[PDB]
Amino acid sequence: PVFLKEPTNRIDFSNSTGAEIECKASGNPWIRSDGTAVGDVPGLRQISSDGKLVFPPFRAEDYRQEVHAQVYACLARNQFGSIISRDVHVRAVVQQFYESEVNNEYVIRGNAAVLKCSIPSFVADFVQVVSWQDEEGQLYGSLGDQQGTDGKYLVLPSGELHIREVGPEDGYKSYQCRTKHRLTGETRLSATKGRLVITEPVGSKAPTFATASKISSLLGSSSSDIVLLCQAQAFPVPYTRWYKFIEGTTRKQAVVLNDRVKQVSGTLIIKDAVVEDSGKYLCVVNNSVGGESVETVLTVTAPLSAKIDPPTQTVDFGRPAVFTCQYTGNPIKTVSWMKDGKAIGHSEPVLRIESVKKEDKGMYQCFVRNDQESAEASAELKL
Amino acid sequence: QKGPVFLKEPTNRIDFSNSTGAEIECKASGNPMPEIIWIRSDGTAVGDVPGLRQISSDGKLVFPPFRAEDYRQEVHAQVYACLARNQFGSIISRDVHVRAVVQQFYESEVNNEYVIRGNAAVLKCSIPSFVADFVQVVSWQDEEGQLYGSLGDQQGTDGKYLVLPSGELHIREVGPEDGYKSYQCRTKHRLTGETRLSATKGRLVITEPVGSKAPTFATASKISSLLGSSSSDIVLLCQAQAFPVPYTRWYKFIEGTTRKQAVVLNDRVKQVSGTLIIKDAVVEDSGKYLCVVNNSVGGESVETVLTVTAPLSAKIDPPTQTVDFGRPAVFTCQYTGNPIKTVSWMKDGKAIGHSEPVLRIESVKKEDKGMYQCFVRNDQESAEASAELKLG
Numbered sequence: 001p002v003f004l005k006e007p008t009n010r011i012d013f014s015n016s017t018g019a020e021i022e023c024k025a026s027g028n029p030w031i032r033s034d035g036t037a038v039g040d041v042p043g044l045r046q047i048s049s050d051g052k053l054v055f056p057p058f059r060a061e062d063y064r065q066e067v068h069a070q071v072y073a074c075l076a077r078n079q080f081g082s083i084i085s086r087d088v089h090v091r092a093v094v095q096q097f098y099e100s101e102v103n104n105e106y107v108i109r110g111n112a113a114v115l116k117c118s119i120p121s122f123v124a125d126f127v128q129v130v131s132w133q134d135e136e137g138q139l140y141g142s143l144g145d146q147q148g149t150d151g152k153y154l155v156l157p158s159g160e161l162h163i164r165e166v167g168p169e170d171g172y173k174s175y176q177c178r179t180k181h182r183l184t185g186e187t188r189l190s191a192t193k194g195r196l197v198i199t200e201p202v203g204s205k206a207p208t209f210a211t212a213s214k215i216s217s218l219l220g221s222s223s224s225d226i227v228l229l230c231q232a233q234a235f236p237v238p239y240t241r242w243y244k245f246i247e248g249t250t251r252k253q254a255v256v257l258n259d260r261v262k263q264v265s266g267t268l269i270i271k272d273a274v275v276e277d278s279g280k281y282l283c284v285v286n287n288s289v290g291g292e293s294v295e296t297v298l299t300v301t302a303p304l305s306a307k308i309d310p311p312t313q314t315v316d317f318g319r320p321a322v323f324t325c326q327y328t329g330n331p332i333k334t335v336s337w338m339k340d341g342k343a344i345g346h347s348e349p350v351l352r353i354e355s356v357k358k359e360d361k362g363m364y365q366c367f368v369r370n371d372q373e374s375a376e377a378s379a380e381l382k383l
Numbered sequence: 384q385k386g387p388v389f390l391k392e393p394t395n396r397i398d399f400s401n402s403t404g405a406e407i408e409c410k411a412s413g414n415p416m417p418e419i420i421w422i423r424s425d426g427t428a429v430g431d432v433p434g435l436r437q438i439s440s441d442g443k444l445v446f447p448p449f450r451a452e453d454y455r456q457e458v459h460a461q462v463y464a465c466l467a468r469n470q471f472g473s474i475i476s477r478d479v480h481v482r483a484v485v486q487q488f489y490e491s492e493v494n495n496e497y498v499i500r501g502n503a504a505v506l507k508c509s510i511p512s513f514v515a516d517f518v519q520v521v522s523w524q525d526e527e528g529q530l531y532g533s534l535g536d537q538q539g540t541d542g543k544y545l546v547l548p549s550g551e552l553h554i555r556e557v558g559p560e561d562g563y564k565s566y567q568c569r570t571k572h573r574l575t576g577e578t579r580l581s582a583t584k585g586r587l588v589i590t591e592p593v594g595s596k597a598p599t600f601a602t603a604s605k606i607s608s609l610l611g612s613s614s615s616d617i618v619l620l621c622q623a624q625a626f627p628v629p630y631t632r633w634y635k636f637i638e639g640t641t642r643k644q645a646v647v648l649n650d651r652v653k654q655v656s657g658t659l660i661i662k663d664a665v666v667e668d669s670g671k672y673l674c675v676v677n678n679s680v681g682g683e684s685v686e687t688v689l690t691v692t693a694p695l696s697a698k699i700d701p702p703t704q705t706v707d708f709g710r711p712a713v714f715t716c717q718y719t720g721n722p723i724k725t726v727s728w729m730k731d732g733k734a735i736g737h738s739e740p741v742l743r744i745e746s747v748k749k750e751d752k753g754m755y756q757c758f759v760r761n762d763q764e765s766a767e768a769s770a771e772l773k774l775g
C-alpha cells in the first residue's frame with residue numbers, strides 16, 4: 001500500500017457547510033489513532049465504498065464532540081502489509097454570531113500608532129482581518145494584497161493597521177476593520193470605529209511600552225511574512241533598534257536590514273520567513289531621557305514532510321537491511337516507528353536490523369510529529 | 384579625623400507636579416564637615432537656574448513650582464546625585480531620579496470583553512502607558528452608579544465581583560444577564576490628586592455555547608513577565624475561555640530544571656477562578672509560573688515570569704580600617720534587595736574597574752587613603768555604601 005493522496009491534519013468546517021475527505025491508496029491490489037475502526041454514526045458522517053469519509057452539514061444540537069472533534073486516521077492494507085496515514089484532526093464548528101471592534105489608541109504626537117482589530121479569542125482561529133477603511137469607506141489598505149512599507153499607512157501581515165508619525169490630521173479620522181470568516185465566505189465590518197487620541201507633548205518622557213511585560217512569544221510559518229511589534233511611546237520621539245540573541249548564549253547581534261528583513265518605524269517585518277529566523281529578539285528603544293527593551297521569542301514552523309530511503313529492498317536472514325527516515329520540518333518533538341500499523345519500542349531515525357526472520361517482513365512506517373501536525377512515510381521490505 | 388558619611392541620602396525617585404515643586408535633602412557629616420556638590424545626569428556639577436533650580440547652604444536641592452512653558456529637560460528630567468567631600472575624600476550618593484510632571488489631562492477607557500457563558504471575565508481599565516505610573520485605579524462603577532472596590536484595603540475573594548489589587552474588575556461565572564450591565568473605572572492621579580471616570584464604558588458580550596471549544600487565551604503569546612514589590616498583593620492573570628468551562632491549575636518551575644511543582648493554595652496564596660493572587664509577596668515568590676487550562680476538548684498552557692522586588696541597601700565591612708604601607712586592605716560590600724543587576728566600586732568619586740563584592744588592595748600606598756564605595760543597581764533603583772581607608 002501507498003498513498004499519493006493523504007488527508008490533511010486539520011479539517012475545519014461549519015455546521016452548515018459540511019465536509020469531505022478522501023484517502024486514495026495504491027498497490028498491485030476508517031480507523032482511529034485511539035486504536036479502533038468504528039463504523040458510521042447515522043447522519044453525523046458516512047464511509048462510502050468510494051473511500052471518502054464524509055461529514056454532512058448538521059444542525060448543531062446534533063453536534064457530538066466525540067464525532068465532530070476527534071483525531072481520525074486512514075489505513076490502507078493489502079496482501080503484503082498495512083500502513084497508517086498521518087493524524088487527521090476533524091473540527092466541526094457551528095456558525096455563530098460574532099463581532100469585531102476597533103478600540104481607541106492613545107499616542108503622543110510624532111510617534112507611530114498601531115490600531116488593532118479586536119476579535120473574540122474563541123473565533124480568532126477562523127476569523128482574520130481583510131482590510132482597514134475610512135469613515136466613508138475608503139481603504140487604508142487591504143491585507144496581503146501586494147504592499148509597500150514606506151507609506152503613511154501600512155496594514156501589517158498580522159492584520160493590525162500601522163500609522164507612521166502621527167499628527168493632528170490622523171486624529172480626525174476613524175478606523176474600521178473588515179474581517180473574514182475563513183470557513184464561510186462571510187465578511188463583516190467591525191461593530192465600532194476606533195479613533196486616535198493624540199496627546200501634545202509637554203515635558204519629556206522616556207520610552208514606555210503599551211504593557212509592562214518585558215517578554216512575549218509568537219509563532220510563524222515559513223514562506224510567510226512575520227511581524228514583530230515593538231509598541232513604544234515617548235517624547236522626544238525615540239529611535240528603535242532590533243537585535244537577535246545568539247542561540248545558546250546571552251550576547252546579541254544587530255538585526256541586519258535588507259530587502260527581506262524590514263523595519264517600519266519600531267516594527268520589524270521578516271519577509272519570506274525561514275526556520276533559521278527563529279530565536280529570541282530584543283527591541284531596544286531610546287531617546288535623550290532614557291531607554292527600554294523588550295524581548296520576543298520567535299518560532300518559525302516548517303511543514304512536516306517525511307520520506308524513507310532505502311524505500312524498497314530484498315534481504316534474507318543473517319544479512320542487513322536499513323531504513324533512514326528523511327524528514328523536514330519545525331519543530332520536531334518526537335520520532336516514532338511503526339511496523340504494519342503497530343507502534344514499536346524505539347524512537348530514533350536509526351533503528352537496528354540484525355537477524356531477520358520473515359516475521360519481520362511487512363510495510364514499515366516512520367512517524368514525525370509535533371504539537372500541531374504529523375508526517376508519515378511508508379517503506380517496504382520484500383523477501 | 385573622619386571622612387564624609389551620609390546622615391540622610393536623597394531618595395531614589397522624586398516625582399512631582401510642576402504646581403507643587405519639590406525639595407530634596409542631602410546631609411552628610413564628617414571632620415572637617417564636608418562640602419556638598421550636586422551633579423546631574425551627564426556628570427556635571429549644577430548650580431542655580433533662576434526660577435527653576437536652587438541649592439541652599441544645607442545642601443538641599445529645590446525645584447520651585449513652574450509654568451509648563453518653563454519646563455527644561457536638562458533640569459526637570461534628570462538623574463541627580465549628591466557628592467560630599469572633605470580633605471579626606473569624596474563619596475557620591477545613590478541615583479536620584481528627578482521627574483517633573485506638567486499637569487495634563489488624560490483619558491482612561493473600559494473596552495468590551497467577549498466571553499463564553501459560564502467562564503470568568505476580566506474588565507481592564509486602559510490607562511495610556513505614558514501616564515500609567517502616575518495613575519491608579521480607585522473604584523469601579525456600573526450603569527446604576529453602584530461602586531465596586533471602594534471599601535477596605537483588601538477585598539473578599541468569594542463574591543461574584545472582585546476588584547483585583549492590580550485594578551481589574553473580575554467577574555465570576557458569567558451568564559447572559561451580566562451582559563445588560565456596563566462599567567466604568569475611576570482613576571486617581573497620584574501627583575495632581577484628581578479623580579475621573581473612564582471616558583468609555585465596557586460591557587460583557589456573552590456568547591451562548593453551541594458546540595465545543597478548546598481553551599483559548601486572550602493573546603497568542605505563550606509567555607509574559609511581571610514585576611511586583613515585596614509585601615504587596617501580586618496578581619497573575621490567566622485569561623482563557625472554553626466550552627465546556629475549563630479547569631485551571633497553577634504551577635511553578637523548579638529553578639534550574641525542566642520540571643515544575645504545583646502551587647500551594649492557602650491563606651496567603653489565593654486562586655479566584657483562573658486568577659492567582661500572591662498576597663504579602665516575598666522575594667522567594669519570584670520565578671517562572673505556568674498556568675494550565677483543560678477541558679474535555681483540549682488543553683493549553685502559558686508562562687509568566689515574576690520578579691518580586693525588594694528595596695536595595697548596602698554597607699561595607701569594615702566601615703573604617705587603618706593599614707600599614709605594603710600590607711593588604713580589604714573591603715566587603717554587603718547588600719540586600721532584589722533583583723541585583725550590578726555591583727560596582729568607586730574610590731573618592733572615581734569609578735573603579737571592579738565588579739565583585741570583595742575589593743582587595745594587595746599592597747597599600749599613600750594615595751590609597753580616602754573613601755571607598757560599592758554601588759548596587761537594578762533597572763529601577765540603586766544603593767551605595769561608603770568606607771574609609773587610613774594609613775598606618
Ligand SMILES: *[C@@H]1O[C@H](CO)[C@@H](O[C@@H]2O[C@H](CO)[C@@H](O[C@@H]3O[C@H](CO[C@H]4O[C@H](CO)[C@@H](O)[C@H](O)[C@@H]4O)[C@@H](O)[C@H](O)[C@@H]3O)[C@H](O)[C@H]2NC(C)=O)[C@H](O)[C@H]1NC(C)=O
Pocket residue numbers: 401402403448449450451485486487488
Ligand atoms: C503647571 O502647569 C500647568 C499647565 O498645564 C498650569 O496650569 C495652567 O495654568 C495656565 C495659567 O498659566 C492656564 O491658562 C489659562 O487658562 C485660561 C482658561 O482656563 C480654562 O481652560 C483651560 C483649558 O483650556 C482649563 O485648564 C481651565 O481649568 C479653564 O477651564 C485662560 O483664559 C487664560 O488666559 C490662561 O490661558 C491653564 O488653564 C492651566 N492648565 C491646566 C491644565 O490647569 C499650572 O499653572 C502650572 N503651575 C504653576 C505655574 O505653578
Ligand SMILES: *[C@@H]1O[C@H](CO)[C@@H](O[C@@H]2O[C@H](CO)[C@@H](O[C@@H]3O[C@H](CO)[C@@H](O)[C@H](O)[C@@H]3O)[C@H](O)[C@H]2NC(C)=O)[C@H](O)[C@H]1NC(C)=O
Pocket residue numbers: 015016058059060061094095096097593
Ligand atoms: C447551524 O447553521 C445554520 C446555518 O445553516 C445557522 O443558521 C441560523 O438559523 C437561525 C434559525 O434557524 C437564524 O435565527 C433567526 O431565526 C429567526 C426566526 O426564529 C428569523 O426571524 C431570523 O431572520 C434568523 O433567521 C440564525 O440567524 C442563523 N444564523 C446563521 C449564522 O446561519 C444555525 O444558527 C446553526 N446552528 C445553531 C444552533 O446556531
Ligand SMILES: *[C@@H]1O[C@H](CO)[C@@H](O)[C@H](O)[C@H]1NC(C)=O
Pocket residue numbers: 284285286290291292293
Ligand atoms: C538605550 O537604552 C538601553 C536600556 O534599555 C541601554 O542599555 C542602552 O545603552 C541605550 N542606548 C543608548 C545609545 O543610550
Ligand SMILES: *[C@@H]1O[C@H](CO)[C@@H](O)[C@H](O)[C@H]1NC(C)=O
Pocket residue numbers: 675676677681682683684
Ligand atoms: C491539560 O493540557 C495540557 C496542555 O498541553 C496537557 O499537557 C495535559 O496533558 C492536559 N491534561 C489532561 C488531563 O488532559
Ligand code: NA
Pocket residue numbers: 392477696697765766767768
Ligand atoms: Na543608598
Ligand code: NA
Pocket residue numbers: 389697767768769
Ligand atoms: Na549608605
